[PDB]
Amino acid sequence: ANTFLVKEDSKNVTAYTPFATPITDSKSDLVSLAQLDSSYQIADQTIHNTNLFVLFKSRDVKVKYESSGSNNISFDSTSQGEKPSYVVEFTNSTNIGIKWTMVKKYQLDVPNVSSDMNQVLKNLILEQPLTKYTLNSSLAKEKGKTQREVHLGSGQANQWTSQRNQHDLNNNPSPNASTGFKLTTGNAYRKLSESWPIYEPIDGTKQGKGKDSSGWSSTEENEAKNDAPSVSGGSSSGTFNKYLNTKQALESIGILFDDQTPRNVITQLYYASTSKLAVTNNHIVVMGNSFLPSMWYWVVERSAQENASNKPTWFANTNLDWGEDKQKQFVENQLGYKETTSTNSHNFHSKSFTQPAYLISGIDSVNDQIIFSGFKAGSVGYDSSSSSSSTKDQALAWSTTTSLDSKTGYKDLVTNDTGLNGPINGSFSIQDTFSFVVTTGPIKTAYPVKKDQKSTVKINSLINATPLNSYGDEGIGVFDALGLNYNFKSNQERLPSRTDQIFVYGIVSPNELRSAKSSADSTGSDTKVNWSNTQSRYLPVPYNYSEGIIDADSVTTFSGLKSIAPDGFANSIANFSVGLKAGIDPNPVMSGKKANYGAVVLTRGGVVRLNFNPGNDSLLSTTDNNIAPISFSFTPFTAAESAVDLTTFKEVTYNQESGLWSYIFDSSLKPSHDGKQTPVTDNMGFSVITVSRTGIELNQDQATTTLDVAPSALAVQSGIQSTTQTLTGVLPLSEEFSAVIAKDSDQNKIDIYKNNNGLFEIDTQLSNSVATNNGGLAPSYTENRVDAWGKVEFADNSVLQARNLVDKTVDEIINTPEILNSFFRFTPAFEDQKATLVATKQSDTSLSVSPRIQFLDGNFYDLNSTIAGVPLNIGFPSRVFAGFAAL
Ligand SMILES: [K+]
């Protein structure tokens, strides 16, 4: 379509011409039209073929989780509350104008819960969501028991040197390795039926109740509410020495409320989960947002009969290729304890599920394939014992960061056994670092349950709110989180985690989508789905988003780590991803081969490129296992891109003519108030980041049918921005020009930005030109002005006699472009704007001509031009020339 769709608010979409004007009566309440009540809002939209697919979700939605029986997750059907999220297909039904009409409507039902699954769900606990205002110190949690305390007890590390071997701990040098972190202080953990609080502790090493939910409601919630009360008033607001109050930051990331109380976790998880949409020839796929963990995603068969309910597939049911199989195992071993003969000791690992949650970046389609990316949300076992048990109320988690004397090559670094089955890092003193070595047997690791616990014990599953597994407030955590563990000897090289800060991506075939649908619909037991064209990557937050890290040496940890993060987040430890988008490269490839395609996604401090081999629709690889997998490239932001508030992402578009992605950030999406309940004042304006491909791409000639270097991208805060206007929309008309529609009060105003060697700058004279449209749909045309149509001066009629063209015929002149171009002189308003003349015979002696002129979008327009079938009626002139012969 020749037009741009703009979400004007939560319900309405309006169609815009390339002249930044609305098509008259295009404005449409998609919610009303989808026959959904006014609690519903548009979450996401996409065009596929010609139709508009819209994902809708409800403010009134209520979900409950009941551990007994077995249809355990369901909607709360008393009051208003049976309000599932829908996807809708609309088609334009006029040839003139835009008249959307509904075609199909698909309901997104709650997930089936298998018996096995319900035994994990029973005791599943979830961290409160990370928020703009969450602090490094808010995240910090107190260190759990050491390796020897769990295994031996009261009985120091002199017993260690010889009792190692009888707990399967042979040659392990780290009796002082953390086994995880206390769940009795810190960010709240809650089960599916409880509700998270509006308060976050400032120092979670001291100030919150963690999972101690009873604790919270009879002591500590009272200290919070008194320290950090909501804005109502007459004003009131107190002191915030202990807790932030983030209710409004919670409202703004999609947490739902009954008055001042968040709804239950499972409800929050369902609302979040229905956030992004992608479409292929057979499927609709819906996945969650990048603010909360999603535990499931929907595959909807477009063939689905009207009033079906469509079912989500659990990710715990979705095995991915993590790159090597050992990468999968790191993750699964740390999910929870095994053998677990025990009694009620059910967690994700103990029941043979895989990683259960992701922080999804987003979701797209290229050619019947689906692309996703995301962060592994942290998940680990915790001891829920209730009697001693040394680990009681502790989470079980440890660094899995590669040892120093590992062979240096992606595969070697990745498969190295360090931390595979249990703890091993912490501090080590011979030129101090956090990582070591790896006589009569190899070094060994094992899970922090002691063998006399074996079957007394109760290890249940939790999920974090970020990509960290391990919150323990020791120094290894900071270096894990910030990509600071480095080796020696070679040209250095950096040591990966396999559990913290793991990015995941892939491309999913339609047969893959088909097993997932089948997994979701499975009778009785859990059936499973393998997605084989995926990878994983250790992707830490840049360390330059902190200050004052002590190395060469009392060590810096999460509770002392100082954030200078500029990207809108208080914290400098947790990664975040947004706005995954694919596109087809316009730059053609050798004629044997199929069109290249990529995706990009934003993370903290850089853009990630995803590279594909088309024509077999796989991740890109090279053969040498040593070089890192070539389907991922990371290019760090400069200062100006890092300055953008990532929490303000509004949308991302791709343009095929230009080969460029445009990320739109709208500051109006900032919460109303701070975590100190102060009003937020920099909520005005917007920012655009433009991402392009870099590098040598696949298949340009015989040299590049294979590659040992991954293609990359580059993001550039492009010069299009504002701290003053309220954005309606950005129309990327061409590489050389973008149009911005904004208000300074109640206006809509059009501004044109022009690209000057890679930097966009506003052009005031073009803006005034484009914006003077006199209420029509396009810029006016004035004879004496170099306006948006340039300027056209016609030759006088006496040119015919001078040039001896009177001897020619009308039809002869009319069939000679070259001659017609000599009847006018054009002056362009921008550098390569083109114009020609269209002729029309008027009589035997005479013709008329009328210019056809190129606009900022690169298209030609003339008298007969339409958009969405509606004539523009731009007033191009026409001029008669006469005195031609009839030979
Ligand atoms: K003009």
Specify which residues 379 forms β-bridges with: 463
Query: Ligand 1 centre from 864 Cα, in Å?
Result: 18
Phi/psi of residue 801, nearest 5 degrees? -65, -45
Query: Ligand 1 centre from 883 Cα, in Å?
Result: 27
Determine the Cα–Cα distance for residues 276 and 581; give it in Å rounded to an integer. Answer: 12
Determine the Cα–Cα distance for residues 23 and 223; give it in Å rounded to an integer. Answer: 56
Query: Ligand 1 centre from 840 Cα, in Å?
Result: 21
Please, is 241 exposed, middle or buried when counting C-beta atoms within 10 Å of its C-beta (0-12, 13-18, 19+)? exposed
Determine the Cα–Cα distance for residues 553 and 487; give it in Å rounded to an integer. Answer: 16
Those residues with Cβ within 8 angstroms of residue 472's Cβ, 6 or more apart along the chain or in another chain: 141, 142, 143, 144, 178, 180, 181, 397
Give the helix/strand (H/E) hosting 301.
strand 296-301
Determine the Cα–Cα distance for residues 348 and 355; give it in Å rounded to an integer. Answer: 8
Do 331 and 499 meet the contact criterion of CB atoms below 8 Å apart?
Answer: yes
Determine the Cα–Cα distance for residues 663 and 665; give it in Å rounded to an integer. Answer: 7
Query: Ligand 1 centre from 793 Cα, in Å?
Result: 9
Query: Ligand 1 centre from 828 Cα, in Å?
Result: 9
Determine the Cα–Cα distance for residues 615 and 595; give it in Å rounded to an integer. Answer: 8
Query: Ligand 1 centre from 838 Cα, in Å?
Result: 17
Query: Ligand 1 centre from 881 Cα, in Å?
Result: 20
- Other C-beta atoms closer than 10 Å to the C-beta of 592 total 9
**DSSP β-ladder status, 40-48 and 28-29:** unpaired
Query: Ligand 1 centre from 679 Cα, in Å?
Result: 48
Query: Ligand 1 centre from 384 Cα, in Å?
Result: 77
Angle at 204 between CA 203 and CA 210, to 5 degrees: 160
Eight-class DSSP state of 294: B
Q: Give the CA distances from residue 866 to residues 771, 851, 860, in Å, rounded to whole numbers and listed in that order.
A: 19, 16, 11
How would you write 582-598 as a 3-class SS string? EEECCCCCCCCCCCCEE
Determine the Cα–Cα distance for residues 189 and 462; give it in Å rounded to an integer. Answer: 8
Those residues with Cβ within 8 angstroms of residue 514's Cβ, 6 or more apart along the chain or in another chain: 299
Domain ranges of the chain: 4-773, 781-886
Give the helix/strand (H/E) hosting 369.
strand 369-376
Phi/psi of residue 479, nearest 5 degrees? -80, -20
Determine the Cα–Cα distance for residues 266 and 760; give it in Å rounded to an integer. Answer: 45
Tell me the Cα Rg of the chain.
31
Query: Ligand 1 centre from 762 Cα, in Å?
Result: 21
Determine the Cα–Cα distance for residues 379 and 491; give it in Å rounded to an integer. Answer: 34
Query: Ligand 1 centre from 784 Cα, in Å?
Result: 6
Phi/psi of residue 174, nearest 5 degrees? -135, 70
Phi/psi of residue 677, nearest 5 degrees? 50, 20
Beta-carbon neighbours within 5 Å of ion ligand 1: 787, 789, 791
Query: Ligand 1 centre from 873 Cα, in Å?
Result: 15
Question: C-alpha 351: how far from its chain's center?
Answer: 30
Determine the Cα–Cα distance for residues 422 and 178; give it in Å rounded to an integer. Answer: 10
Query: Ligand 1 centre from 874 Cα, in Å?
Result: 11
Do 670 and 680 meet the contact criterion of CB atoms below 8 Å apart?
Answer: yes
Do 742 and 687 meet the contact criterion of CB atoms below 8 Å apart?
Answer: no
Which residue carries 């997605």 as its tokens? 531
Those residues with Cβ within 8 angstroms of residue 335's Cβ, 6 or more apart along the chain or in another chain: 347, 348, 349, 353, 355, 356, 379, 380, 381, 461
Query: Ligand 1 centre from 842 Cα, in Å?
Result: 24
Query: Ligand 1 centre from 347 Cα, in Å?
Result: 72
Eight-class DSSP state of 428: B
Query: Ligand 1 centre from 829 Cα, in Å?
Result: 9
Specify which residues 714 forms β-bridges with: 692
Query: Ligand 1 centre from 786 Cα, in Å?
Result: 5
Query: Ligand 1 centre from 650 Cα, in Å?
Result: 36
Eight-class DSSP state of 832: T
Q: How many CA atoms lie within 13 A of 752 on its CB side?
A: 26
Those residues with Cβ within 8 angstroms of residue 681's Cβ, 6 or more apart along the chain or in another chain: none
Determine the Cα–Cα distance for residues 795 and 784; give it in Å rounded to an integer. Answer: 14
Q: At how many Å resolution was this determined?
A: 2.4
Query: Ligand 1 centre from 779 Cα, in Å?
Result: 10
Query: Ligand 1 centre from 790 Cα, in Å?
Result: 5
Query: Ligand 1 centre from 865 Cα, in Å?
Result: 17
Query: Ligand 1 centre from 471 Cα, in Å?
Result: 65
Query: Ligand 1 centre from 741 Cα, in Å?
Result: 23
Do 595 and 589 meet the contact criterion of CB atoms below 8 Å apart?
Answer: yes
Query: Ligand 1 centre from 748 Cα, in Å?
Result: 24
Q: Give the CA distances from residue 182 to residues 255, 423, 571, in Å, rounded to whole numbers and listed in that order.
A: 26, 16, 21
Query: Ligand 1 centre from 781 Cα, in Å?
Result: 5
Give the helix/strand (H/E) hosting 513.
helix 510-521
Please, is 872 exposed, middle or buried when counting C-beta atoms within 10 Å of its C-beta (0-12, 13-18, 19+)? buried
Please name the amino acid found at residue 538: Y
Query: Ligand 1 centre from 154 Cα, in Å?
Result: 90
Query: Ligand 1 centre from 826 Cα, in Å?
Result: 9
Widest Cα–Cα separation across the chain: 117
Query: Ligand 1 centre from 791 Cα, in Å?
Result: 4
**DSSP β-ladder status, 296-301 and 312-314:** antiparallel
Query: Ligand 1 centre from 6 Cα, in Å?
Result: 29
Query: Ligand 1 centre from 769 Cα, in Å?
Result: 10
Query: Ligand 1 centre from 396 Cα, in Å?
Result: 72
Query: Ligand 1 centre from 682 Cα, in Å?
Result: 40
Query: Ligand 1 centre from 805 Cα, in Å?
Result: 27
The residue numbers preceding gaps of C to N over 2.5 A in the chain are 232, 387, 438, 553
Query: Ligand 1 centre from 110 Cα, in Å?
Result: 59
Q: Which two tokens mark 814? A: 């009319």
Do 690 and 641 meet the contact criterion of CB atoms below 8 Å apart?
Answer: no
Structure determined by = X-ray
Do 619 and 638 meet the contact criterion of CB atoms below 8 Å apart?
Answer: no
Query: Ligand 1 centre from 787 Cα, in Å?
Result: 5
The SS3 call for residue 768 is helix
Query: Ligand 1 centre from 851 Cα, in Å?
Result: 10
Determine the Cα–Cα distance for residues 612 and 369; give it in Å rounded to an integer. Answer: 11
**DSSP β-ladder status, 529-531 and 318-320:** parallel
Q: How many CA atoms lie within 13 A of 65 on its CB side?
A: 27
Query: Ligand 1 centre from 877 Cα, in Å?
Result: 10
Query: Ligand 1 centre from 876 Cα, in Å?
Result: 9
Query: Ligand 1 centre from 867 Cα, in Å?
Result: 21
- Other C-beta atoms closer than 10 Å to the C-beta of 166 total 10
How would you write 13-34 as a 3-class SS string? EEEECCCCCECCCCCEEHHHHC
Do 379 and 330 meet the contact criterion of CB atoms below 8 Å apart?
Answer: no
Query: Ligand 1 centre from 540 Cα, in Å?
Result: 54
Query: Ligand 1 centre from 788 Cα, in Å?
Result: 7
Query: Ligand 1 centre from 814 Cα, in Å?
Result: 24
Of the chain, the end-to-end C-alpha distance in Å amounts to 46
Do 381 and 349 meet the contact criterion of CB atoms below 8 Å apart?
Answer: yes
Please name the amino acid found at residue 822: S
The SS3 call for residue 602 is strand
How do the residues of the chain divide into helix, strand and coil, expressed in percent and rounded to 5? 15, 30, 55
Query: Ligand 1 centre from 775 Cα, in Å?
Result: 18
Ramachandran region of residue 419, left (φ > 0), alpha (ψ -120 to 50) or beta?
A: left
Query: Ligand 1 centre from 728 Cα, in Å?
Result: 28
Query: Ligand 1 centre from 834 Cα, in Å?
Result: 13
Phi/psi of residue 664, nearest 5 degrees? -100, 125
Query: Ligand 1 centre from 749 Cα, in Å?
Result: 22
Angle at 121 between CA 117 and CA 122, to 5 degrees: 120
Query: Ligand 1 centre from 98 Cα, in Å?
Result: 30
Query: Ligand 1 centre from 783 Cα, in Å?
Result: 5
Do 185 and 122 meet the contact criterion of CB atoms below 8 Å apart?
Answer: no
- Other C-beta atoms closer than 10 Å to the C-beta of 296 total 24
Q: Which two tokens mark 362? A: 């987003």
Do 193 and 64 meet the contact criterion of CB atoms below 8 Å apart?
Answer: yes
Do 545 and 471 meet the contact criterion of CB atoms below 8 Å apart?
Answer: no
Please name the amino acid found at residue 246: T
Phi/psi of residue 120, nearest 5 degrees? -80, -50
Query: Ligand 1 centre from 224 Cα, in Å?
Result: 66
Do 614 and 692 meet the contact criterion of CB atoms below 8 Å apart?
Answer: no
Determine the Cα–Cα distance for residues 12 and 35; give it in Å rounded to an integer. Answer: 14
Query: Ligand 1 centre from 753 Cα, in Å?
Result: 20
Those residues with Cβ within 8 angstroms of residue 345's Cβ, 6 or more apart along the chain or in another chain: 337, 457, 458, 459, 460
